[PDB]
């Protein structure tokens, strides 16, 4: 249901990790 | 020259990026493309009527992973958001 | 003699391609 | 019954979540202002 020097760092705790 | 981070200057604009063969269908009169947030994305070559996608060439942060200097001086480096080819 | 120009008279403001976007 | 009540209860969220995308309004906002902040940040590059 969800959706220039500018970078997006990734989250440390990955989605698969989050699920566990 | 394609597939290389180059310093391009097409008719009226300039920039730095990777020029690749596109799959976009420009109108016969249009010249330049744009992304959603007012960003150049594709250019028609003034000489060959080809549509080229502009991908900004690789860059990212460099972070030094080190143990404390009280323990060691050997380090490891993290090149953010790149693949191990361009480094 | 007067008529309703319902929705017509719209021409591309520029030579700039855009896609799936509201400009 | 209480198990059944909770079981049928569980299914209801599935429909409510599936039905209206407004069920996730807050998180969508968290994305949205963040999306807006960046866009506004990006557009400013066009200002004289
Ligand atoms: C520019 O000139 C070359 C001549 O070799 C031709 O092949 C090409 O199609 C021309 N481009 C346009 C847009 O006329
Ligand atoms: C850190 O280095 C100091 C010397 O500057 C030393 O006295 C101390 O024991 C060291 N600490 C550890 C945990 O090794
Ligand atoms: C770079 O790494 C990505 C992994 O996301 C891989 O899919 C891609 O083929 C690699 N390309 C090169 C040129 O190393």
State how far the Cα of D14 lies from the Cα of B66, in Å rounded to an integer: 47
Cβ separation of C17 and B29 shorter than 8 Å?
no
Residues written for chain B: 87
Longest CA span, chain A: 36
Which of B46, B45, B39 is CA-nearest to residue B20? B45
Greatest extent of chain C over all pairs of C-alpha atoms, in Å: 40
Ramachandran angles phi, psi of A13, nearest 5°: -95, 105
Distance (Å, whole) CA B30 – CA B21: 17
Tokens encoding D19? 């039905």
Q: Is D41 on the interface with A (CB under 8 A)?
A: yes
> How far is B22 from B32, CA to CA, in rounded Å?
13
Nearest CA to ligand 1 atom 10: B47
Distances in Å between the Cα of C7 and the Cα atoms of B70, C1, C3, C4 are: 75, 19, 12, 9
The secondary structure element, H or E, covering residue B17 is: strand B14-21
Evaluate whether chains B and C are touching (3 or more beta carbon pairs less than 8 Å apart): yes
Chain center to CA of C3: 19
Tell me which residue has tokens 């500018």.
A6
Nearest CA to ligand 1 atom 7: B48
The two tokens of residue B57 are 């060439």
Write the DSSP string, B25-44: ---SS--B---TTS---EEE
C18 CB neighbour count, 10 Å cutoff: 17
Contacts of B80 in chain A (CB under 8 A): 7, 9
Categorise residue C20: left if φ over 0, alpha if ψ from -120 to 50, beta otherwise: left
Provide the resolution (angstroms).
3.6
Nearest CA in chain B to A8: B81
Q: Tell me how far CA of residue C1 lies from CA of C4, C5, C6, C7, in angstroms.
A: 11, 13, 16, 19
**Ligand with the closest atom to the CA of B46:** 1
Residue D33, H or E segment: helix D25-43
B68: exposed, middle or buried (Cβ count in 10 Å: 0-12, 13-18, 19+): exposed
**Hey, is the C-beta of A3 within 8 angstroms of any chain B C-beta?**
no
Closest residue in C to B32 (Cα–Cα): C16
Phi and psi at residue D13, to the nearest 5°: -60, -40
Candidates C11, C13, C14, C17: best to mutate against B (most CBs of B within 10 A) is: C17
């Amino acid at each position: 249901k969800v959706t220039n020097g500018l970078t997006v760092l990734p989250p440390l705790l990955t989605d698969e990790m989050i699920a566990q | 020259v394609k597939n290389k981070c180059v310093n391009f200057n097409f008719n009226g604009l300039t920039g730095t990026g990777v020029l690749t063969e596109s799959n976009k269908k420009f109108l016969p009169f249009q010249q330049f493309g744009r992304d959603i947030a007012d960003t150049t994305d594709a250019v028609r070559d003034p000489q060959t009527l080809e549509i080229l996608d502009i991908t900004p060439c690789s860059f990212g942060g460099v972070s030094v992973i080190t143990p404390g200097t009280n323990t060691s001086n050997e380090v490891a480096v993290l090149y953010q958001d790149v693949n191990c080819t361009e480094v | 003699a007067y008529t309703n120009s319902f929705t017509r008279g719209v021409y591309y403001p520029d030579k700039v391609f855009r896609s799936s976007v509201l400009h | 019954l209480i198990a059944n009540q909770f079981n049928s209860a569980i299914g209801k969220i599935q429909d409510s979540l599936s039905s209206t995308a407004s069920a996730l309004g807050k998180l969508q906002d968290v994305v949205n202002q963040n999306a807006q902040a960046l866009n506004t940040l990006v557009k400013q590059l066009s200002s004289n």
